[PDB]
Amino acid sequence: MDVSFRLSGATSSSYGVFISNLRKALPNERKLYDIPLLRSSLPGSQRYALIHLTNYADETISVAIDVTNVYIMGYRAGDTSYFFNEASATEAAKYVFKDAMRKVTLPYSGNYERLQTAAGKIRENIPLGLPALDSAITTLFYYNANSAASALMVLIQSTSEAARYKFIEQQIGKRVDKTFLPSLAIISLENSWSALSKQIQIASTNNGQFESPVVLINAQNQRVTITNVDAGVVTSNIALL
Ligand SMILES: [Ca+2]
Numbered sequence: 001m002d003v004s005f006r007l008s009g010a011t012s013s014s015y016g017v018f019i020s021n022l023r024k025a026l027p028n029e030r031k032l033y034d035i036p037l038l039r040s041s042l043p044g045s046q047r048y049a050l051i052h053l054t055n056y057a058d059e060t061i062s063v064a065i066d067v068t069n070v071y072i073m074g075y076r077a078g079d080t081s082y083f084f085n086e087a088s089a090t091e092a093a094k095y096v097f098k099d100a101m102r103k104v105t106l107p108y109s110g111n112y113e114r115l116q117t118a119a120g121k122i123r124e125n126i127p128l129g130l131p132a133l134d135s136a137i138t139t140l141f142y143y144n145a146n147s148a149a150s151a152l153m154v155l156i157q158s159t160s161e162a163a164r165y166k167f168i169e170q171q172i173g174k175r176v177d178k179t180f181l182p183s184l185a186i187i188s189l190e191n192s193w194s195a196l197s198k199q200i201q202i203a204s205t206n207n208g209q210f211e212s213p214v215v216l217i218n219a220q221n222q223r224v225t226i227t228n229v230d231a232g233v234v235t236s237n238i239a240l241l
Pocket residue numbers: 038039040241
């Protein structure tokens with residue numbers, strides 16, 4: 001289906017549906033503990049998915065996602081494509097937005113270390129929420145090299161990260177007419193996603209137990225360590241492995 005999200009008329013529920021639809025567009029190798037396990041490898045023609053986002057002023061950006069790991073590869077605004085300077089994104093450009101009249105290769109890869117350096121700010125200090133996403137879209141639709149990095153981080157957390165965790169989806173979706181600075185808990189989840197997924201996978205081969213504890217930060221700003229699949233983050237939060 002055409003997976004889109006319109007900020008004009010948005011509600012917490014319409015954002016939840018958009019994120020649910022985005023997760024459903026991702027092929028699954030199978031499920032582990034009721035959580036979809038992403039395909040570890042796919043041929044280019046089956047590897048990328050698109051989602052479309054419209055800001056309050058009815059301006060739209062289309063976003064390319066690598067279905068193997070939910071990473072954002074690039075976006076399109078009108079007749080121009082923009083891809084991250086990284087191997088996976090170069091491949092993505094061979095399969096999506098192929099008919100863009102103009103193409104540009106962003107100055108950096110899609111990793112937070114590179115984007116934070118390019119933006120001069122860390123995720124902790126960049127407001128999220130639906131109004132934040134509207135502004136990021138406007139900022140990306142009228143591309144400017146000096147402002148794209150920060151907006152891309154808002155876009156990425158609003159899509160990929162929300163898709164990976166129900167807590168993140170919920171937290172962003174609840175801010176309909178206000179923004180908010182993400183908590184260390186949100187940052188901890190994003191940072192620990194590959195480590196956590198890997199431990200859940202390993203847990204399935206170890207009678208439900210992690211081989212390496214995963215230390216996280218909860219909503220109360222407290223450190224808490226996860227060691228098995230009975231943990232709330234595994235049973236009621238992570239949505240993709
Ligand atoms: Ca994998």
